[PDB]
Design an enzyme around this catalytic site. Structure first.
Site, PDB file in Angstrom:
ATOM      1  N   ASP A  64      18.329 121.425 -61.707  1.00 45.28           N
ATOM      2  CA  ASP A  64      19.561 121.031 -61.850  1.00 45.28           C
ATOM      3  C   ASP A  64      20.464 121.784 -63.088  1.00 45.28           C
ATOM      4  O   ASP A  64      21.784 121.204 -63.374  1.00 45.28           O
ATOM      5  N   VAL A 122      25.626 124.960 -67.684  1.00 49.31           N
ATOM      6  CA  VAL A 122      26.289 124.042 -67.153  1.00 49.31           C
ATOM      7  C   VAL A 122      24.845 123.241 -66.846  1.00 49.31           C
ATOM      8  O   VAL A 122      24.140 123.935 -66.834  1.00 49.31           O
ATOM      9  N   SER A 123      24.579 122.346 -67.377  1.00 50.15           N
ATOM     10  CA  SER A 123      24.280 121.397 -66.527  1.00 50.15           C
ATOM     11  C   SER A 123      25.113 119.476 -65.657  1.00 50.15           C
ATOM     12  O   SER A 123      25.417 119.611 -66.816  1.00 50.15           O
ATOM     13  N   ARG A 124      24.501 120.018 -65.190  1.00 48.90           N
ATOM     14  CA  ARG A 124      24.697 118.517 -63.706  1.00 48.90           C
ATOM     15  C   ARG A 124      24.651 117.531 -63.978  1.00 48.90           C
ATOM     16  O   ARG A 124      25.212 116.484 -63.173  1.00 48.90           O
ATOM     17  N   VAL A 125      23.479 117.096 -64.848  1.00 53.00           N
ATOM     18  CA  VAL A 125      23.498 116.290 -64.900  1.00 53.00           C
ATOM     19  C   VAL A 125      23.038 115.100 -66.306  1.00 53.00           C
ATOM     20  O   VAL A 125      22.682 116.096 -66.928  1.00 53.00           O
TER      21      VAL A 125
END
Lengths: 305, 171, 52, 48, 265
Positions: free
Chosen positions: A145, A169-172
């Site tokens: 994630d 990135v941290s999609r959440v």
């Protein structure tokens, strides 16, 4: 903390560090040392997971670091080829994805029914040459994630921790961070994003637009602000000011060399005077108008002087 | 707490802007903050004054230190005393400070009201229409003193007269 | 000139407070030493016991 | 006062119907600064 | 990996190749404007020079220098800096007016006491009379320029639209005009303050010419440097291309072996 493929001495140093920081009490160290068997190495995350699930099930929150899954993959590679199973892509038989996916999907933020107990996962794949196109790195990237790319060149550049933020990135979530901190670091991202383009222009050393070099000047100070020496974390109540100062551009002026000097002193100053401000950030965790103004005044008070 | 002391200190810093030039008063204040923070870090660092004589003494089965150091810790509860004769002699220094402070305070208070009176006196008596130059001679014999000295000197030009009452000359 | 005098007026009283405050902190550090040896001795005592 | 003040001002003044060319405008305008030096020690870039 | 870092480095060199190509071409364009001014200017100057020859007016000192604020003009900045340094043996202490940042640093380093005046904002502008006029007006007071029995200007003479040669010349000054051996094959009034006027006019008219000469040679230098750059980028392109091609083949070979190994089992 799950340690797969690592030597007893390394582990012994780690446990010494953890016991020194007396975090060992709440820490569990699940190990599959370099000596330990390849089936046992494969089984080690899955049994680590079981221990975690007991917390998760109970409604208790916990965190599982899977360091390093890359050595787990080698263990399954060995295991499978001596079960005579046909080599997969890069000698990791395909269904390795299935193996990893079932393991990784047991990190879950459970329902209020389940006591909200959330086991959180941090997988760790130590990519050799940053080779993410390697079958296991490609596979994992899809499952996870977030990705927290780190880069050696940036380490050499002296950025320690050395983070390749472009691919990090941290999609959440964003309730995955503090509301206050969300407000301040809103344009930390923007400044940095502008900085990336600007840095490219700055390279080849062509005569920059004054505006681009404003970005460049601001950006540099931010970069020095981010760096932190290992085994020294920082409390969020005192990370909000530093970012406020930077983002509200008060640091943009302050010279790069003495940013580090400034940072240390700023923290000392806030401890002395605007410790009321810190208490409020701790207590309320979302920057109110009053806090933003108070903080602005405090920041001005120590940026000037 | 410590913050009361420091708020009054930093208030005194921005007051000290008005009276800057005490270069080791401020170093002493910086120090008072330092050493206050040192006792604060000391007292916050503070471990227990004893071992866990319940648990961690019942942990050690062997008996040669568990009664001994328990009794030695309870023995050495006497750990000697603080100074308090330093708050008498430093208090003497505070007395000197207070004496001087009040003298200064009273001096400037007197002067303040003197300046109020002076402003009013300049306001209520100070021509701005006519007034005989004889009256200016009477109120300042400095006028006649310089004039007599100039008449004696053989001067009839005052330097600066021309520099704010330019000569009328048609040449 | 009135302005200058006014600064000095306020200073003259308030400075005496800071004197008091400063000597008071120093007194407190004295007491902290006696505490410190209790703190210390306990740490040592736990350690000797740990070796045991 | 001086000739180059006369010529300078003459160029400034002539651009004060109104119509003019880019080469003309450059021959009669400057946007610039100048840093005098002495020591290092410089009075700041002040409009040339 | 290797393959991608090779390919990326080869790409970097390609992007640079494009930039250096673009710049060289643009240099020809910018150079044209510098020259365009310079012809007409030189023609104007020549009419004045017709007088000066026939007049036989002849000729501390000044050093003036011309560079662009802008970089990537090649080593004109530092060849001129060097040719200034050569002539900063001829005068160790002479007062330098530096028009443009790039030479400014280099001369400023060689002596900073010398530096009395320096400009900034010219180095991107075409040679034009207004600029020269304002500099001239300021020059008399600051440098005591008319007082100095020489004035000397350094520039790069723009021989061709492919060259730069650092060059210098001496401009007339008010002492020189005063003590001039002739100025008697033409006549002018003693009731005209011709030294203070003529000095200023030829201070600017010659200086403007010098600036034009310099600016054209400089942009001409930019073309030369950027052409050699395009070439250098090509060579590196070839080296990393060969590396790219070999590296690409090797990945295939290693993969091929894996396929064979799998098939064999």
């Amino acid at each position: 903390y799950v340690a797969v493929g690592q030597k007893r001495s390394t582990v012994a140093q780690l446990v010494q560090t953890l016991e020194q920081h007396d975090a060992m009490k709440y820490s569990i160290i699940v190990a599959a040392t370099a000596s330990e068997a390849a089936p046992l190495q494969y089984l080690a995350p899955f049994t680590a997971a079981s221990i975690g699930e007991w917390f998760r099930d109970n409604g208790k929150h916990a965190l599982i670091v899977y360091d390093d899954l890359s050595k787990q993959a080698v263990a399954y590679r060995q295991l499978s080829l001596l079960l005579r199973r046909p080599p997969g892509r890069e000698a990791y038989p395909g269904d390795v994805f299935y193996l990893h996916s079932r393991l990784l999907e047991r990190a879950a933020k459970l329902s209020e029914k389940e006591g909200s107990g959330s086991l959180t996962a941090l997988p760790v794949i130590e990519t050799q040459g940053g080779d993410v196109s390697a079958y296991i790195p490609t596979n994992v990237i899809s499952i996870t994630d977030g990705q927290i790319f780190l880069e050696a060149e940036l380490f050499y550049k002296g950025i320690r921790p050395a983070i390749n933020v472009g691919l990090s990135v941290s999609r959440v979530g964003s309730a995955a961070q503090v509301k206050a901190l969300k407000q301040v670091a809103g344009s930390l991202k923007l400044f940095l994003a502008q900085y990336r383009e600007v840095a490219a222009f700055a390279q080849f050393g062509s005569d920059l637009d004054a505006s681009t070099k404003q970005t460049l000047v601001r950006g540099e100070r931010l970069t020095q602000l981010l760096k932190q020496n290992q085994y020294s974390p920082l409390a969020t109540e005192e990370q909000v000011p530093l970012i406020y100062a930077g983002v509200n551009g008060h640091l943009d002026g302050i010279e790069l060399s003495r940013i580090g000097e400034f940072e240390s002193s700023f923290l000392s100053y806030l401890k002395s005077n605007h410790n009321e401000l810190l208490t409020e950030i701790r207590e309320k965790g979302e920057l109110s108008k009053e806090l933003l103004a108070s903080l602005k005044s405090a920041t001005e008070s120590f940026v000037a002087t | 707490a410590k913050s009361a002391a420091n708020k009054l200190d930093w208030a005194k810093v921005i007051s000290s802007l008005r009276i800057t030039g005490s270069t080791a008063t401020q170093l002493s204040s910086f120090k008072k903050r330092n050493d206050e923070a040192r006792r604060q870090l000391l007292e916050l660092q503070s471990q227990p004054t004893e071992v866990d004589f319940s648990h961690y003494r019942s942990v050690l089965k062997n008996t040669s230190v568990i009664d001994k150091i328990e009794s030695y810790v309870k023995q050495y509860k006497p750990v000697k005393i603080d100074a308090s004769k330093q708050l008498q002699v430093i208090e003497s220094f505070e007395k000197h400070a207070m004496t001087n402070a009040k003298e200064t305070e009273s001096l400037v208070s007197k002067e303040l009201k003197d300046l109020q009176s002076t402003l009013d006196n300049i306001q209520s008596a100070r021509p701005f229409d006519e007034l005989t130059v004889d009256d200016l001679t009477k109120i300042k014999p400095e006028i006649d003193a310089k004039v007599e000295e100039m008449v004696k000197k053989g001067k009839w030009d005052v330097p600066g007269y021309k520099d704010r009452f330019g000569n009328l000359n048609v040449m | 000139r009135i302005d200058s005098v006014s600064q000095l007026q306020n200073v003259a009283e308030t400075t005496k407070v800071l004197f008091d405050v400063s000597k008071e902190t120093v007194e407190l550090e004295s007491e902290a030493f006696e505490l410190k040896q209790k703190v210390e001795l306990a740490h040592e005592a736990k350690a000797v016991l740990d070796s045991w | 006062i001086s000739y180059a003040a006369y010529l300078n001002v003459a160029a400034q003044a002539i651009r004060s119907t109104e119509l003019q060319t880019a080469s003309v405008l450059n021959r009669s305008q400057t946007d610039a600064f100048y840093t005098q030096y002495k020591n290092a020690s410089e009075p700041t870039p002040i409009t040339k | 990996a290797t393959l991608k870092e090779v390919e990326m480095r080869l790409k970097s060199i390609k992007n640079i190749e494009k930039i250096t190509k673009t710049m060289k071409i643009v240099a020809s364009t910018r150079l044209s404007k510098a020259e365009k001014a310079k012809i007409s200017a030189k023609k104007m100057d020549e009419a004045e020079q017709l007088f000066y020859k026939n007049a036989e007016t002849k000729n501390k000192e000044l050093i003036v220098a011309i560079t662009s604020d802008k970089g990537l003009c090649g080593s004109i900045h530092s060849q001129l800096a060097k040719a200034v340094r050569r002539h900063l043996n001829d005068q160790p202490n002479a007062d330098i007016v530096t028009i443009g940042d790039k030479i400014k640093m280099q001369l400023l380093r060689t002596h900073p006491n010398n530096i009395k005046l320096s400009i900034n904002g010219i180095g991107k502008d075409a040679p034009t009379f207004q600029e020269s006029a304002l500099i001239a007006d300021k020059l008399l007071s600051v440098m005591k320029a008319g007082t100095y029995p020489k004035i000397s200007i350094f520039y790069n003479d723009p021989v061709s639209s492919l060259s730069f040669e650092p060059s210098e010349k001496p401009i007339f000054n008010a002492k020189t005009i005063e003590q001039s051996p002739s100025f008697g094959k033409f006549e002018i009034d003693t009731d005209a303050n011709v030294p203070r006027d003529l000095f200023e006019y030829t201070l600017a008219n010659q200086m403007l010419t010098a600036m034009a000469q310099g600016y054209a040679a400089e942009i001409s230098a930019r073309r030369n440097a950027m052409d050699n750059a395009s070439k250098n980028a090509g060579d590196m392109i070839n080296r990393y291309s060969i590396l790219y091609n070999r590296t690409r083949q090797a990945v295939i070979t290693n993969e091929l072996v894996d396929i064979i190994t799998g098939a064999s089992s």
